[PDB]
Amino acid sequence: LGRIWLPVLIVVAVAAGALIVMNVRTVFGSNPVVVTEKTSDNAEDFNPKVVTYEIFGSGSSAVINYMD
Amino acid sequence: DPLTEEGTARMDELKVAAADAIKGTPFEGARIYLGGSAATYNDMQIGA
């Protein structure tokens, strides 16, 4: 391999250098924005508790104030 | 001095702190952008 050893080793070295270049070149940057995760709850109406107000008396009418 | 090795190391801490402050609030899903001299030189050091 007197006339084969040189070009093969040259190609091997060039491939190694290209691989190193490709790997490290992309590491820079790659983190421009930060996006926080979202964890919401299911907004549904199943078995809602029911509150009832009742006003009654011997009078005809009344004035009523209440808290919703 | 913000333009030192100590100054540029605070950039990740700020982003972590803001992301943790947002956690659990209606602000979830927000986007955080950090800029300035110290951030610029942090990026410069990584690139170098």
mmCIF file of N, CA and C in Angstrom:
data_model
loop_
_atom_site.group_PDB
_atom_site.id
_atom_site.type_symbol
_atom_site.label_atom_id
_atom_site.label_comp_id
_atom_site.label_asym_id
_atom_site.label_seq_id
_atom_site.Cartn_x
_atom_site.Cartn_y
_atom_site.Cartn_z
ATOM 1 N N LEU A 1 0.823 -1.204 0.000
ATOM 2 C CA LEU A 1 0.000 0.000 0.000
ATOM 3 C C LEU A 1 0.860 1.259 0.000
ATOM 4 N N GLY A 2 1.982 1.203 -0.722
ATOM 5 C CA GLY A 2 2.895 2.334 -0.756
ATOM 6 C C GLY A 2 2.291 3.581 -1.371
ATOM 7 N N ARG A 3 1.389 3.412 -2.338
ATOM 8 C CA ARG A 3 0.731 4.530 -3.000
ATOM 9 C C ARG A 3 -0.739 4.652 -2.621
ATOM 10 N N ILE A 4 -1.171 3.985 -1.552
ATOM 11 C CA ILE A 4 -2.575 3.998 -1.159
ATOM 12 C C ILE A 4 -2.715 4.557 0.250
ATOM 13 N N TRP A 5 -1.654 4.439 1.054
ATOM 14 C CA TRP A 5 -1.750 4.819 2.461
ATOM 15 C C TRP A 5 -1.984 6.316 2.621
ATOM 16 N N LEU A 6 -1.392 7.131 1.741
ATOM 17 C CA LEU A 6 -1.492 8.581 1.918
ATOM 18 C C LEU A 6 -2.894 9.103 1.620
ATOM 19 N N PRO A 7 -3.479 8.875 0.433
ATOM 20 C CA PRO A 7 -4.820 9.435 0.177
ATOM 21 C C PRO A 7 -5.893 8.925 1.128
ATOM 22 N N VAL A 8 -5.808 7.662 1.548
ATOM 23 C CA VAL A 8 -6.802 7.120 2.471
ATOM 24 C C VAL A 8 -6.730 7.838 3.812
ATOM 25 N N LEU A 9 -5.515 8.035 4.328
ATOM 26 C CA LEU A 9 -5.359 8.744 5.594
ATOM 27 C C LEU A 9 -5.792 10.198 5.464
ATOM 28 N N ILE A 10 -5.520 10.815 4.312
ATOM 29 C CA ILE A 10 -5.962 12.188 4.080
ATOM 30 C C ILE A 10 -7.483 12.272 4.134
ATOM 31 N N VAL A 11 -8.161 11.339 3.465
ATOM 32 C CA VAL A 11 -9.622 11.334 3.466
ATOM 33 C C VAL A 11 -10.153 11.100 4.877
ATOM 34 N N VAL A 12 -9.520 10.189 5.619
ATOM 35 C CA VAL A 12 -9.955 9.911 6.988
ATOM 36 C C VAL A 12 -9.840 11.164 7.849
ATOM 37 N N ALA A 13 -8.702 11.854 7.758
ATOM 38 C CA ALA A 13 -8.501 13.061 8.554
ATOM 39 C C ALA A 13 -9.497 14.146 8.168
ATOM 40 N N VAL A 14 -9.742 14.313 6.866
ATOM 41 C CA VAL A 14 -10.690 15.328 6.410
ATOM 42 C C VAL A 14 -12.086 15.019 6.934
ATOM 43 N N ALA A 15 -12.475 13.742 6.892
ATOM 44 C CA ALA A 15 -13.781 13.348 7.409
ATOM 45 C C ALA A 15 -13.887 13.626 8.903
ATOM 46 N N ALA A 16 -12.829 13.323 9.660
ATOM 47 C CA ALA A 16 -12.851 13.588 11.095
ATOM 48 C C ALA A 16 -12.988 15.080 11.375
ATOM 49 N N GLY A 17 -12.229 15.900 10.649
ATOM 50 C CA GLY A 17 -12.320 17.337 10.843
ATOM 51 C C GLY A 17 -13.692 17.880 10.497
ATOM 52 N N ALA A 18 -14.273 17.390 9.400
ATOM 53 C CA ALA A 18 -15.611 17.817 9.011
ATOM 54 C C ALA A 18 -16.639 17.418 10.059
ATOM 55 N N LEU A 19 -16.509 16.207 10.604
ATOM 56 C CA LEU A 19 -17.420 15.761 11.651
ATOM 57 C C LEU A 19 -17.328 16.661 12.877
ATOM 58 N N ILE A 20 -16.102 16.983 13.297
ATOM 59 C CA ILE A 20 -15.917 17.846 14.464
ATOM 60 C C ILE A 20 -16.508 19.225 14.199
ATOM 61 N N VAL A 21 -16.293 19.748 12.988
ATOM 62 C CA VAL A 21 -16.840 21.057 12.629
ATOM 63 C C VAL A 21 -18.363 21.034 12.703
ATOM 64 N N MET A 22 -18.975 19.999 12.125
ATOM 65 C CA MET A 22 -20.432 19.922 12.088
ATOM 66 C C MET A 22 -21.020 19.809 13.488
ATOM 67 N N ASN A 23 -20.382 19.021 14.354
ATOM 68 C CA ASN A 23 -20.935 18.794 15.687
ATOM 69 C C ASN A 23 -20.913 20.066 16.529
ATOM 70 N N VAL A 24 -19.787 20.782 16.526
ATOM 71 C CA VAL A 24 -19.611 21.887 17.467
ATOM 72 C C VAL A 24 -20.255 23.163 16.938
ATOM 73 N N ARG A 25 -20.368 23.292 15.615
ATOM 74 C CA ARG A 25 -20.868 24.536 15.037
ATOM 75 C C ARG A 25 -22.312 24.806 15.443
ATOM 76 N N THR A 26 -23.100 23.752 15.656
ATOM 77 C CA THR A 26 -24.520 23.924 15.941
ATOM 78 C C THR A 26 -24.820 24.133 17.420
ATOM 79 N N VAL A 27 -23.833 23.970 18.302
ATOM 80 C CA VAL A 27 -24.100 24.068 19.735
ATOM 81 C C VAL A 27 -24.373 25.513 20.140
ATOM 82 N N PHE A 28 -23.759 26.469 19.447
ATOM 83 C CA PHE A 28 -23.956 27.873 19.780
ATOM 84 C C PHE A 28 -25.403 28.291 19.530
ATOM 85 N N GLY A 29 -25.868 29.251 20.325
ATOM 86 C CA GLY A 29 -27.260 29.666 20.237
ATOM 87 C C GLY A 29 -28.173 28.569 20.746
ATOM 88 N N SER A 30 -29.174 28.221 19.939
ATOM 89 C CA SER A 30 -30.086 27.107 20.198
ATOM 90 C C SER A 30 -30.859 27.266 21.504
ATOM 91 N N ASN A 31 -31.043 28.498 21.971
ATOM 92 C CA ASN A 31 -31.873 28.743 23.144
ATOM 93 C C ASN A 31 -32.349 30.189 23.157
ATOM 94 N N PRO A 32 -33.099 30.630 22.146
ATOM 95 C CA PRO A 32 -33.449 32.053 22.067
ATOM 96 C C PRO A 32 -34.591 32.458 22.986
ATOM 97 N N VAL A 33 -35.570 31.575 23.179
ATOM 98 C CA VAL A 33 -36.775 31.893 23.936
ATOM 99 C C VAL A 33 -37.016 30.803 24.971
ATOM 100 N N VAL A 34 -37.735 31.163 26.030
ATOM 101 C CA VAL A 34 -38.169 30.229 27.063
ATOM 102 C C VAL A 34 -39.690 30.247 27.097
ATOM 103 N N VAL A 35 -40.299 29.072 26.966
ATOM 104 C CA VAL A 35 -41.751 28.925 26.968
ATOM 105 C C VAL A 35 -42.143 28.108 28.190
ATOM 106 N N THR A 36 -42.946 28.703 29.066
ATOM 107 C CA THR A 36 -43.385 28.015 30.271
ATOM 108 C C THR A 36 -44.486 27.010 29.951
ATOM 109 N N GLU A 37 -44.570 25.971 30.775
ATOM 110 C CA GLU A 37 -45.582 24.941 30.600
ATOM 111 C C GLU A 37 -46.917 25.391 31.179
ATOM 112 N N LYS A 38 -47.998 24.883 30.594
ATOM 113 C CA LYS A 38 -49.355 25.237 30.994
ATOM 114 C C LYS A 38 -50.035 24.019 31.604
ATOM 115 N N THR A 39 -50.612 24.195 32.792
ATOM 116 C CA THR A 39 -51.343 23.139 33.501
ATOM 117 C C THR A 39 -52.640 23.746 34.029
ATOM 118 N N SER A 40 -53.709 23.631 33.250
ATOM 119 C CA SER A 40 -55.017 24.134 33.638
ATOM 120 C C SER A 40 -55.903 22.997 34.132
ATOM 121 N N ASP A 41 -57.018 23.371 34.748
ATOM 122 C CA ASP A 41 -57.984 22.415 35.264
ATOM 123 C C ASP A 41 -59.194 22.326 34.344
ATOM 124 N N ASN A 42 -59.899 21.205 34.439
ATOM 125 C CA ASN A 42 -61.104 21.012 33.645
ATOM 126 C C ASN A 42 -62.235 21.876 34.185
ATOM 127 N N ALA A 43 -62.707 22.812 33.364
ATOM 128 C CA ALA A 43 -63.794 23.710 33.748
ATOM 129 C C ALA A 43 -65.107 23.092 33.288
ATOM 130 N N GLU A 44 -65.729 22.318 34.175
ATOM 131 C CA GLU A 44 -66.988 21.648 33.884
ATOM 132 C C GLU A 44 -67.953 21.855 35.043
ATOM 133 N N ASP A 45 -69.235 21.606 34.771
ATOM 134 C CA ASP A 45 -70.304 21.790 35.748
ATOM 135 C C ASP A 45 -71.026 20.456 35.939
ATOM 136 N N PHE A 46 -70.498 19.633 36.836
ATOM 137 C CA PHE A 46 -71.117 18.367 37.196
ATOM 138 C C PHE A 46 -71.358 18.348 38.698
ATOM 139 N N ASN A 47 -72.576 17.994 39.094
ATOM 140 C CA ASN A 47 -73.002 18.031 40.487
ATOM 141 C C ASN A 47 -72.688 19.368 41.166
ATOM 142 N N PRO A 48 -73.197 20.484 40.642
ATOM 143 C CA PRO A 48 -72.970 21.767 41.315
ATOM 144 C C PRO A 48 -73.884 21.888 42.525
ATOM 145 N N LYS A 49 -73.342 22.396 43.628
ATOM 146 C CA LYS A 49 -74.162 22.585 44.814
ATOM 147 C C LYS A 49 -75.203 23.663 44.553
ATOM 148 N N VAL A 50 -76.407 23.446 45.071
ATOM 149 C CA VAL A 50 -77.547 24.312 44.809
ATOM 150 C C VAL A 50 -77.950 24.993 46.108
ATOM 151 N N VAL A 51 -78.020 26.320 46.078
ATOM 152 C CA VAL A 51 -78.398 27.135 47.226
ATOM 153 C C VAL A 51 -79.711 27.828 46.902
ATOM 154 N N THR A 52 -80.669 27.754 47.821
ATOM 155 C CA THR A 52 -82.002 28.306 47.609
ATOM 156 C C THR A 52 -82.334 29.293 48.717
ATOM 157 N N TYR A 53 -82.736 30.500 48.330
ATOM 158 C CA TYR A 53 -83.229 31.506 49.259
ATOM 159 C C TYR A 53 -84.751 31.520 49.218
ATOM 160 N N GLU A 54 -85.384 31.574 50.389
ATOM 161 C CA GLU A 54 -86.838 31.629 50.482
ATOM 162 C C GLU A 54 -87.239 32.717 51.462
ATOM 163 N N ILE A 55 -88.123 33.610 51.028
ATOM 164 C CA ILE A 55 -88.695 34.649 51.876
ATOM 165 C C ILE A 55 -90.209 34.541 51.790
ATOM 166 N N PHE A 56 -90.869 34.484 52.942
ATOM 167 C CA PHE A 56 -92.321 34.405 52.983
ATOM 168 C C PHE A 56 -92.811 34.968 54.305
ATOM 169 N N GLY A 57 -93.998 35.563 54.286
ATOM 170 C CA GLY A 57 -94.554 36.137 55.495
ATOM 171 C C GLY A 57 -95.997 36.532 55.285
ATOM 172 N N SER A 58 -96.571 37.135 56.328
ATOM 173 C CA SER A 58 -97.961 37.571 56.255
ATOM 174 C C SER A 58 -98.118 38.836 55.424
ATOM 175 N N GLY A 59 -97.024 39.538 55.153
ATOM 176 C CA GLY A 59 -97.112 40.771 54.404
ATOM 177 C C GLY A 59 -97.346 40.542 52.925
ATOM 178 N N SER A 60 -97.577 41.647 52.217
ATOM 179 C CA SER A 60 -97.790 41.576 50.776
ATOM 180 C C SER A 60 -96.464 41.512 50.029
ATOM 181 N N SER A 61 -95.595 42.495 50.249
ATOM 182 C CA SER A 61 -94.309 42.578 49.574
ATOM 183 C C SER A 61 -93.192 42.747 50.596
ATOM 184 N N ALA A 62 -91.958 42.778 50.097
ATOM 185 C CA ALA A 62 -90.791 42.896 50.955
ATOM 186 C C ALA A 62 -89.628 43.464 50.160
ATOM 187 N N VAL A 63 -88.636 43.978 50.880
ATOM 188 C CA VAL A 63 -87.391 44.450 50.284
ATOM 189 C C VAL A 63 -86.289 43.484 50.692
ATOM 190 N N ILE A 64 -85.582 42.932 49.709
ATOM 191 C CA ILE A 64 -84.679 41.809 49.925
ATOM 192 C C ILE A 64 -83.285 42.181 49.446
ATOM 193 N N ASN A 65 -82.289 41.940 50.294
ATOM 194 C CA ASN A 65 -80.882 42.036 49.931
ATOM 195 C C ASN A 65 -80.221 40.697 50.214
ATOM 196 N N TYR A 66 -79.372 40.243 49.297
ATOM 197 C CA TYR A 66 -78.722 38.950 49.448
ATOM 198 C C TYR A 66 -77.364 38.986 48.769
ATOM 199 N N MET A 67 -76.512 38.045 49.158
ATOM 200 C CA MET A 67 -75.197 37.864 48.563
ATOM 201 C C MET A 67 -75.257 36.706 47.583
ATOM 202 N N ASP A 68 -74.916 36.967 46.327
ATOM 203 C CA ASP A 68 -74.854 35.874 45.373
ATOM 204 C C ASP A 68 -73.643 34.996 45.668
ATOM 205 N N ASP B 1 -19.604 45.045 39.277
ATOM 206 C CA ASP B 1 -19.373 45.174 37.848
ATOM 207 C C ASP B 1 -20.149 44.096 37.115
ATOM 208 N N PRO B 2 -21.108 44.447 36.260
ATOM 209 C CA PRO B 2 -21.872 43.404 35.566
ATOM 210 C C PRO B 2 -21.108 42.749 34.433
ATOM 211 N N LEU B 3 -20.043 43.374 33.944
ATOM 212 C CA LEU B 3 -19.280 42.844 32.818
ATOM 213 C C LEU B 3 -18.093 42.011 33.283
ATOM 214 N N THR B 4 -18.359 41.023 34.131
ATOM 215 C CA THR B 4 -17.339 40.112 34.623
ATOM 216 C C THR B 4 -17.820 38.682 34.443
ATOM 217 N N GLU B 5 -17.039 37.739 34.966
ATOM 218 C CA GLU B 5 -17.454 36.342 34.912
ATOM 219 C C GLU B 5 -18.594 36.070 35.881
ATOM 220 N N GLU B 6 -18.636 36.797 36.997
ATOM 221 C CA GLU B 6 -19.759 36.667 37.919
ATOM 222 C C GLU B 6 -21.029 37.242 37.311
ATOM 223 N N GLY B 7 -20.904 38.356 36.590
ATOM 224 C CA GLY B 7 -22.077 38.989 36.015
ATOM 225 C C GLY B 7 -22.757 38.131 34.969
ATOM 226 N N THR B 8 -21.978 37.549 34.058
ATOM 227 C CA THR B 8 -22.558 36.746 32.992
ATOM 228 C C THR B 8 -23.133 35.430 33.489
ATOM 229 N N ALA B 9 -22.769 34.992 34.689
ATOM 230 C CA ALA B 9 -23.300 33.751 35.230
ATOM 231 C C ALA B 9 -24.683 33.912 35.839
ATOM 232 N N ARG B 10 -25.169 35.145 35.978
ATOM 233 C CA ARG B 10 -26.483 35.371 36.561
ATOM 234 C C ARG B 10 -27.607 35.287 35.540
ATOM 235 N N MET B 11 -27.293 35.122 34.255
ATOM 236 C CA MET B 11 -28.335 35.147 33.234
ATOM 237 C C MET B 11 -29.255 33.940 33.348
ATOM 238 N N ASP B 12 -28.685 32.750 33.539
ATOM 239 C CA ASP B 12 -29.513 31.557 33.677
ATOM 240 C C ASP B 12 -30.361 31.620 34.938
ATOM 241 N N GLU B 13 -29.802 32.168 36.016
ATOM 242 C CA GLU B 13 -30.548 32.275 37.262
ATOM 243 C C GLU B 13 -31.778 33.155 37.096
ATOM 244 N N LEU B 14 -31.651 34.258 36.357
ATOM 245 C CA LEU B 14 -32.794 35.143 36.151
ATOM 246 C C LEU B 14 -33.908 34.440 35.389
ATOM 247 N N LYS B 15 -33.554 33.717 34.328
ATOM 248 C CA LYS B 15 -34.565 33.014 33.546
ATOM 249 C C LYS B 15 -35.236 31.927 34.372
ATOM 250 N N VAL B 16 -34.456 31.195 35.168
ATOM 251 C CA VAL B 16 -35.037 30.175 36.036
ATOM 252 C C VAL B 16 -35.987 30.811 37.045
ATOM 253 N N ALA B 17 -35.572 31.923 37.650
ATOM 254 C CA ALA B 17 -36.401 32.577 38.656
ATOM 255 C C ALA B 17 -37.709 33.071 38.057
ATOM 256 N N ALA B 18 -37.646 33.678 36.872
ATOM 257 C CA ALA B 18 -38.870 34.147 36.233
ATOM 258 C C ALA B 18 -39.782 32.986 35.863
ATOM 259 N N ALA B 19 -39.213 31.910 35.317
ATOM 260 C CA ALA B 19 -40.028 30.760 34.945
ATOM 261 C C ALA B 19 -40.682 30.130 36.166
ATOM 262 N N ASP B 20 -39.998 30.159 37.310
ATOM 263 C CA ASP B 20 -40.585 29.609 38.526
ATOM 264 C C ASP B 20 -41.641 30.539 39.106
ATOM 265 N N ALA B 21 -41.465 31.849 38.941
ATOM 266 C CA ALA B 21 -42.482 32.787 39.404
ATOM 267 C C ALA B 21 -43.758 32.657 38.587
ATOM 268 N N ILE B 22 -43.628 32.386 37.288
ATOM 269 C CA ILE B 22 -44.811 32.220 36.448
ATOM 270 C C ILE B 22 -45.572 30.950 36.811
ATOM 271 N N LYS B 23 -44.866 29.918 37.265
ATOM 272 C CA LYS B 23 -45.463 28.607 37.500
ATOM 273 C C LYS B 23 -46.654 28.689 38.446
ATOM 274 N N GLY B 24 -47.753 28.046 38.056
ATOM 275 C CA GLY B 24 -48.943 27.998 38.879
ATOM 276 C C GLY B 24 -49.864 29.189 38.771
ATOM 277 N N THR B 25 -49.591 30.122 37.868
ATOM 278 C CA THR B 25 -50.363 31.352 37.755
ATOM 279 C C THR B 25 -51.051 31.413 36.398
ATOM 280 N N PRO B 26 -51.983 32.344 36.181
ATOM 281 C CA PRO B 26 -52.553 32.503 34.836
ATOM 282 C C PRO B 26 -51.531 32.894 33.789
ATOM 283 N N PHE B 27 -50.336 33.315 34.198
ATOM 284 C CA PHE B 27 -49.284 33.662 33.254
ATOM 285 C C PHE B 27 -48.655 32.446 32.591
ATOM 286 N N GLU B 28 -49.063 31.233 32.954
ATOM 287 C CA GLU B 28 -48.476 30.033 32.374
ATOM 288 C C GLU B 28 -48.620 30.039 30.861
ATOM 289 N N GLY B 29 -47.550 29.654 30.177
ATOM 290 C CA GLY B 29 -47.489 29.744 28.738
ATOM 291 C C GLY B 29 -46.865 31.011 28.210
ATOM 292 N N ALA B 30 -46.380 31.886 29.083
ATOM 293 C CA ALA B 30 -45.749 33.120 28.654
ATOM 294 C C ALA B 30 -44.362 32.841 28.093
ATOM 295 N N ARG B 31 -43.822 33.834 27.396
ATOM 296 C CA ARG B 31 -42.514 33.739 26.763
ATOM 297 C C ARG B 31 -41.588 34.767 27.393
ATOM 298 N N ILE B 32 -40.389 34.333 27.767
ATOM 299 C CA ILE B 32 -39.440 35.163 28.498
ATOM 300 C C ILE B 32 -38.256 35.472 27.597
ATOM 301 N N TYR B 33 -37.951 36.758 27.445
ATOM 302 C CA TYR B 33 -36.835 37.220 26.626
ATOM 303 C C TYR B 33 -35.904 38.021 27.521
ATOM 304 N N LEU B 34 -34.614 37.718 27.468
ATOM 305 C CA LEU B 34 -33.624 38.399 28.287
ATOM 306 C C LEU B 34 -32.529 38.973 27.401
ATOM 307 N N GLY B 35 -32.245 40.264 27.573
ATOM 308 C CA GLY B 35 -31.232 40.929 26.785
ATOM 309 C C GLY B 35 -30.481 41.946 27.619
ATOM 310 N N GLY B 36 -29.430 42.496 27.024
ATOM 311 C CA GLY B 36 -28.589 43.447 27.720
ATOM 312 C C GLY B 36 -27.120 43.205 27.458
ATOM 313 N N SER B 37 -26.246 43.936 28.150
ATOM 314 C CA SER B 37 -24.813 43.766 27.931
ATOM 315 C C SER B 37 -24.331 42.420 28.454
ATOM 316 N N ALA B 38 -24.758 42.056 29.664
ATOM 317 C CA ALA B 38 -24.285 40.822 30.276
ATOM 318 C C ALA B 38 -24.710 39.603 29.472
ATOM 319 N N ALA B 39 -25.947 39.595 28.972
ATOM 320 C CA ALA B 39 -26.394 38.478 28.146
ATOM 321 C C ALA B 39 -25.596 38.400 26.853
ATOM 322 N N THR B 40 -25.325 39.553 26.243
ATOM 323 C CA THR B 40 -24.517 39.587 25.033
ATOM 324 C C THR B 40 -23.151 38.965 25.276
ATOM 325 N N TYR B 41 -22.505 39.327 26.383
ATOM 326 C CA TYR B 41 -21.169 38.796 26.632
ATOM 327 C C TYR B 41 -21.203 37.341 27.079
ATOM 328 N N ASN B 42 -22.293 36.901 27.702
ATOM 329 C CA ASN B 42 -22.458 35.479 27.981
ATOM 330 C C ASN B 42 -22.479 34.676 26.683
ATOM 331 N N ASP B 43 -23.263 35.143 25.709
ATOM 332 C CA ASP B 43 -23.283 34.488 24.405
ATOM 333 C C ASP B 43 -21.922 34.561 23.727
ATOM 334 N N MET B 44 -21.244 35.703 23.850
ATOM 335 C CA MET B 44 -19.913 35.847 23.272
ATOM 336 C C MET B 44 -18.953 34.821 23.853
ATOM 337 N N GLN B 45 -19.007 34.609 25.168
ATOM 338 C CA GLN B 45 -18.100 33.656 25.800
ATOM 339 C C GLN B 45 -18.372 32.236 25.324
ATOM 340 N N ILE B 46 -19.649 31.863 25.228
ATOM 341 C CA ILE B 46 -19.977 30.522 24.744
ATOM 342 C C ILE B 46 -19.461 30.328 23.319
ATOM 343 N N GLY B 47 -19.722 31.312 22.457
ATOM 344 C CA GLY B 47 -19.242 31.227 21.092
ATOM 345 C C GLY B 47 -17.732 31.152 21.014
ATOM 346 N N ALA B 48 -17.040 31.917 21.859
ATOM 347 C CA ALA B 48 -15.583 31.912 21.847
ATOM 348 C C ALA B 48 -15.030 30.556 22.257
#
